[PDB]
């Protein structure tokens, strides 16, 4: 029962003023109309402001917006992590230099955004999985420039809240094992409960929501983002069938392993993303063999 109002509350500019002191320093720039049209181009990719023996494509140039973005990047230290209203171009990592989302110019942001389907989803499918009959609100799209941080791998956790109650914590990179998570399992559990109780509980715009956190090298918990309490958010080591059910998410355990019941369920990966860099059509040997066959058939058709 996720409504379109819940998606609006998870926009960056909606919650950042209220949680500024517990998250990463960021700058929010309104997206100009012509810049929005550029990112929505249905043709081939040409990057804007990049500076033997056929057509030469040129992208639109936005001088006033490029200097505005560059001034915000300099105010954050010269390196930024770009997002839109909700999403980051996490699926366009392969195309950027050194496979990094760190951006120093507007051109770096353009190359990521126009190569990312998560960004395209923010424009074209913002209110998916919503169940209310209300008409789609008008979105005012914005560029979010977040100060770049060198995060430690295996220190990010997704937290699920239902009726202002923290009902579960999940490791965010749930497909990768990290040894230090299970050794610090109880200390992480306590620091996220204290953070939520002091800084998150009763302060977000909804009862049911999801929020991601990062625990730095000194043990301090930082806020990363707010996500909708619905199918649009990956439940990671949890399933939404048991998160809505409000059941005993801790599971079957003995009294020698179980802690207090007030604590939520904490799941991490025990001892044991790919379609991002592939096309929508998606072993490269069989793929090109399949390309030769289809090209010969299209010559006949």
């Amino acid at each position: 029962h996720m409504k379109k109002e819940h998606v609006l509350h998870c926009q960056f500019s909606a919650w950042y003023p209220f949680f500024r002191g517990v998250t990463i320093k960021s700058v929010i720039l309104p997206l100009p109309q012509n810049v929005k049209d550029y990112l929505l181009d249905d043709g081939t990719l040409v990057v804007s402001g990049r500076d033997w023996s056929t057509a030469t494509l040129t992208a639109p140039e936005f001088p006033e917006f490029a200097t505005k973005v560059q001034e915000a990047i300099n105010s954050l230290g010269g390196s930024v992590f770009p997002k839109l209203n909700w999403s980051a171009p996490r699926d366009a990592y392969w195309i950027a230099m050194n496979s990094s989302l760190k951006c120093k110019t507007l051109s770096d942001i353009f190359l990521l955004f126009k190569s990312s389907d998560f960004i395209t989803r923010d424009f074209t499918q913002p209110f998916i999985h919503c169940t209310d009959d209300s008409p789609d609100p008008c979105i005012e799209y914005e560029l979010v420039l977040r100060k770049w941080c060198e995060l430690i791998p295996g220190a990010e956790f997704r937290c699920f809240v239902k009726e202002n109650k923290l009902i579960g914590i999940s490791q965010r990179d749930y497909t990768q094992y990290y040894d230090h998570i299970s050794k610090q399992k109880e200390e992480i559990r306590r620091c996220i409960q204290d953070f939520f109780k002091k800084h998150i509980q009763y302060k977000f715009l909804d009862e049911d929501f999801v929020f991601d956190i990062y625990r730095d090298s000194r043990g301090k918990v930082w806020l990363i983002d707010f996500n909708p309490f619905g199918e649009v958010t990956d439940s990671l080591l949890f399933t939404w069938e048991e998160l809505i059910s409000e059941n005993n998410l801790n599971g079957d355990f003995s009294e020698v392993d179980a802690q207090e019941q007030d604590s939520p369920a904490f799941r991490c990966t025990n001892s044991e993303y790919l379609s991002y860099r592939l096309p929508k059509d998606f072993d490269a040997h069989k793929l090109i063999d399949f390309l030769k066959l289809k090209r010969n058939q299209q010559e006949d058709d």
Binding site: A55, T56, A96, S115, T124, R277, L278, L291, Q298
Partner: protein, 94 residues
């Protein structure tokens, strides 16, 4: 095997897209294509075009070798769509 920043390739484009699907446009300079090389992907900015040959300036240098076959995709309606394949003939290494 080395690390290449530019690639000289021989390419073959499909007549139309997969999945009456739309035709495939010819390669144009300064367009960025998605390049699938083995087990990794990268971007390729078209810098020179001939009937069967071409040069792409990689947005991110990869490790490959002369003779390895590649896959090419083009941004079509905000989706990466396969348009053809190529094979490396020459490369600029760093």
């Amino acid at each position: 095997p080395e690390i290449f920043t530019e690639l000289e390739i021989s390419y073959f484009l499909l007549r139309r897209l997969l999945g009456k699907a739309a035709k495939v446009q010819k390669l144009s300079k300064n367009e960025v294509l998605m390049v699938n090389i083995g087990s990794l992907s990268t971007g390729g900015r078209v810098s020179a075009v001939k009937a069967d040959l071409g040069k792409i300036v990689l947005t991110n240098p990869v490790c490959t070798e002369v003779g390895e076959k590649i896959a090419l995709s083009r941004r079509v309606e905000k989706h990466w769509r396969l348009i053809g394949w190529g094979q490396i003939r020459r490369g600029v290494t760093i």
